[PDB]
Amino acid sequence: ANFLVHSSNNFGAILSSTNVGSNTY
Amino acid sequence: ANFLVHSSNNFGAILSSTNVGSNTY
Amino acid sequence: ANFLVHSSNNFGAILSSTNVGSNTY
Amino acid sequence: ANFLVHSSNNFGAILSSTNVGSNTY
Amino acid sequence: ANFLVHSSNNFGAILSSTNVGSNTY
Amino acid sequence: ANFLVHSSNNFGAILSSTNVGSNTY
Amino acid sequence: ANFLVHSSNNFGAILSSTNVGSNTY
Amino acid sequence: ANFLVHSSNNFGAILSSTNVGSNTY
Amino acid sequence: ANFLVHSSNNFGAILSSTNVGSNTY
Amino acid sequence: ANFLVHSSNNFGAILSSTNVGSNTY
C-alpha cells in the first residue's frame, strides 16, 4: 500500500488505512 | 491498494480503507 | 483497489472501502 | 474497484463499497 | 466496479455497492 | 417543547420539530 | 425548548429543532 | 434553550437547534 | 442558551446552535 | 451563553455556537 494526502484546512481528523485483522479506532 | 485524498475544510473525519478481516471503527 | 476523494466542507464522515470478510464500523 | 467522490457540504456520512462476504456497518 | 458520486448538502447517508454474498448494513 | 431521541444505526436523517411559520427543509 | 439525544452509530445526520420563521436546511 | 447530547460512534453529523429567522445549513 | 455535550468516538462532526438570523454552515 | 463539553476520542470536529448574523463554517 502507498498513497498521497492533500487537504486544505480540514479541522476534522482524516483516516485511511488497510486492515487484515482487528483494530480499535 | 493506493489512493489520493483531496478536501476543502471538511470538519468531519474522512475514512477509507479495505478490509479482509474484522475491525472496530 | 485505488481511488480519489474530493469534497467541500462535508461535516459528515465519508466512508468507502471494499471488504471480503467481517468488519465493525 | 476504483472510484471518485465529489460532494458539497453533505452533513451525512457517505458510504460506498463492494463486498463478497459479511460486514457490519 | 467503478463510479462517481456527486451531491449537494445531503444530510442523509448515501449507500451504493455490489454484493455477491452476505452483508449487514 | 422537549424530547428524547434514541436510535440504532439509522443511516437516514431523522427530523422532528414544531413550526408556527414557514420553513424550508 | 430542552432535549436529550441518544444514538448508536447512526451514519445519518440527525435533525431536530423548532422554528417560528423561515430556515434553509 | 438548554440540552444534553449523548452518542456512540455516530459517523454522521448531528444537528439540533432552534430558529426564529433564516439560516443556511 | 446553555448545554452539555457527551460523546464516544463520533467520527462525525456534531453541530448544535440557535439562530435568529442567517448563517452558512 | 455558557456550556460544558465532554468527549471521548471523537476523531470528528465538534461544533456548537449561537448566531444572530451571518457566518461561514
From Swiss-Prot, chains A, B, C, D, E, F, G, H, I, J:
It comes from the Eukaryota. It is found in: Secreted. Amyloid fibrils are degraded by insulin-degrading enzyme IDE. The modification Tyrosine amide is found at residue 25. Can form homodimers. Interacts with IDE and INS. Interaction with INS inhibits homodimerization and fibril formation. Amylin/IAPP is a glucoregulatory peptide hormone that plays an important role in the regulation of energy homeostasis. Selectively inhibits insulin-stimulated glucose utilization and glycogen deposition in muscle, while not affecting adipocyte glucose metabolism. IAPP function is mediated by the CALCR-RAMPs (AMYRs) receptor complexes. Amylin can also bind CALCR receptor in the absence of RAMPs, although it is more selective for AMYRs. Belongs to the calcitonin family. IAPP is the peptide subunit of amyloid found in pancreatic islets of type 2 diabetic patients and in insulinomas. The mature protein is largely unstructured in the absence of a cognate ligand, and has a strong tendency to form fibrillar aggregates. Homodimerization may be the first step of amyloid formation. This is Islet amyloid polypeptide. The lineage of its organism: Eukaryota, Metazoa, Chordata, Craniata, Vertebrata.
